């Protein structure tokens, strides 16, 4: 189940961002399909709660090539809520840059691009501080809500 994580990590600027994958001062695009050869690390798509996306092909068959074959892709469109709620996904590209995808913010009350449910809050997930180092001092709040019928328990990181 570990092969399903893309590992095209190209630390070209000598920043050491790949290290925390094994074990801070400087502090939209539509989620369709991304090529795994540009991804380094886990891909978290944000339904009301966070979910892990693994390397698959175009049909959706899971691949176990660490995201190296050019046919490897991430089907972010297939993870969308059918009821049409807010949606977004984040990941890290080969050179240590956090990438986001989601719906354009229709207003200040609407959601952001990544895990930004609010322009102030952020969905907590195991790799939040790796993709977003500046949110370390954010406060966590436990959240319960019904979206499209499903219950969703998750934590949000706000100022």
């Amino acid at each position: 189940h570990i092969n399903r994580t893309a590992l095209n990590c190209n630390d070209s600027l000598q920043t050491g961002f790949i290290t925390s994958l094994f074990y801070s001062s400087g502090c939209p695009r539509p989620c369709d399909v991304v090529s795994a050869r540009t991804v380094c690390g886990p891909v978290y798509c944000f339904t009301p709660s966070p979910v892990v996306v693994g390397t698959t092909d175009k049909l959706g068959i899971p691949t176990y090539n660490w995201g190296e074959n050019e046919t490897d892709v991430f089907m972010l469109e297939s993870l969308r809520p059918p009821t049409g709620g807010w949606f977004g996904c984040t990941w890290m590209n080969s050179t240590g840059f956090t990438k986001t995808c989601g719906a354009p913010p229709g207003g200040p009350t609407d959601g952001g691009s990544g895990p930004w449910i609010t322009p102030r809050c952020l969905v907590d997930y195991p790799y939040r501080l790796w993709h977003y180092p500046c949110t370390v001092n954010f406060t966590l709040h436990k959240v319960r809500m019904f979206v499209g019928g499903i219950e969703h328990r998750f934590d949000a990181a706000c100022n």
Partner: antibody, heavy 119, light 107 residues
């Protein structure tokens, strides 16, 4: 600042050596092994990354070396060409990953270990 | 990939500047080059990593530069300790080493 390795050994041709590597909190992502014949430069014996369980080896060594994990390295079918000093390296920061390996600069070297193949 | 160092031996006096050259047979893509020194009867010490960046604890007189096929290690002022063998290493592809460069006292 030098990692502890197993003592020097003399082995007959065709035998097998097992050299160890001892960590000194400690952080490292892989186990490397660099060897140097008497009067030669550095050669890269294989690597082994424990978090992913994958490993690479060189063409000359592919048929008789494995590296596992304190880390260990074993050579079989020894010939006189394998007379060399063998260092283990546990580097800290990976720079280039490409599924399912990660390449970086050798960081924390061991003291070394002499292996002499002589009957 | 093949790393060719030049020259085989470098002959300088204490205080002069050393410039060692490492030339790759193929481009090192995103520069993943390292420099090591080996004193007689000692384990190698990492001097320079990632082309230009200096390793922690390494004195400021050591400097690395270069990109593509041609890389360079520079010792601005040679101290008595620096006279040793220096290896350049590429970790962009399968790890490879170049043959050393001996730095001895000129006379």
């Amino acid at each position: 600042q030098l990692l502890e390795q197993s003592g020097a050994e003399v082995k007959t041709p065709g035998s097998s050596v097992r050299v160890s590597c001892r960590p000194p909190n400690f952080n490292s992502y892989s186990i490397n092994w660099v060897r140097q014949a008497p009067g030669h430069g550095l050669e890269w014996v294989g690597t082994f990354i424990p978090m992913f369980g994958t490993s690479k080896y060189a063409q000359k060594f592919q048929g008789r070396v494995t590296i596992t994990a304190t880390a260990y390295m074993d050579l079989n079918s020894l010939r006189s060409d394998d007379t060399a000093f063998y260092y283990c390296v546990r580097p800290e920061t990976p720079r280039y990953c490409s599924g399912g390996f990660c390449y970086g600069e050798f960081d924390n070297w061991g003291q070394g270990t002499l292996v002499t193949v002589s009957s | 990939l093949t790393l060719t160092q030049s020259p085989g031996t470098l002959s300088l006096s204490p205080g002069k500047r050393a410039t060692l050259s490492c030339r790759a047979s193929q481009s090192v893509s995103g520069s993943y080059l390292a420099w090591y020194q080996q004193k007689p009867g000692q384990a190698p010490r990492l001097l320079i990593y990632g082309a230009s960046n200096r390793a922690t604890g390494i004195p400021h007189r050591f400097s690395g530069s270069g990109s593509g096929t041609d890389f360079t290690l520079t010792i601005s002022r040679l101290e008595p300790e620096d006279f040793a063998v220096y290896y350049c290493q590429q970790y962009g592809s399968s790890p490879t080493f170049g043959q050393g460069t001996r730095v001895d006292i000129k006379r």
